[PDB]
Amino acid sequence: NLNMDLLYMAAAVMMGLAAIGAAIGIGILGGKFLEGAARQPDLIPLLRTQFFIVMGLVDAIPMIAVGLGLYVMFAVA
Amino acid sequence: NLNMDLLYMAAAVMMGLAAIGAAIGIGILGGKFLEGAARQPDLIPLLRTQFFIVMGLVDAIPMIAVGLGLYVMFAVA
Amino acid sequence: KFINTMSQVPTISQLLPLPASDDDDLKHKSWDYLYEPDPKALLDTLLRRYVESQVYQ
Question: In this complex, is the C-beta atom of A60 within 8 Å of any C-beta atom belonging to chain C?
Answer without folding.
Answer: no
